Amino acid sequence: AYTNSFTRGVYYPDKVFRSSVLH
Amino acid sequence: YFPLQSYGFQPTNVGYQPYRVVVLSFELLHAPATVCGPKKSTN
Numbered sequence: 001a002y003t004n005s006f007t008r009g010v011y012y013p014d015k016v017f018r019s020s021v022l023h
Numbered sequence: 024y025f026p027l028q029s030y031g032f033q034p035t036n037v038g039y040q041p042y043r044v045v046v047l048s049f050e051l052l053h054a055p056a057t058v059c060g061p062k063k064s065t066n
Contacts, residue, residue, distance in 0.1 A: 015053035 032041040 030041065
């Protein structure tokens with residue numbers, strides 16, 4: 001059996017703060 | 024058969040001798056520091 005992942009399963013790639021940016 | 028081989032270290036052996044080796048590997052990451060040099064902090 002399956003379902004759609006939608007936009008799930010994303011995580012902070014590194015322990016660095018960033019803001020107002022499209023990394 | 025299995026891939027294991029054994030040495031035969033004798034005191035009469037210089038590349039023929041046993042060598043002790045340690046590798047210090049350093050974890051550079053943006054996580055919290057936990058291993059540090061003895062250099063003292065300021066205010």
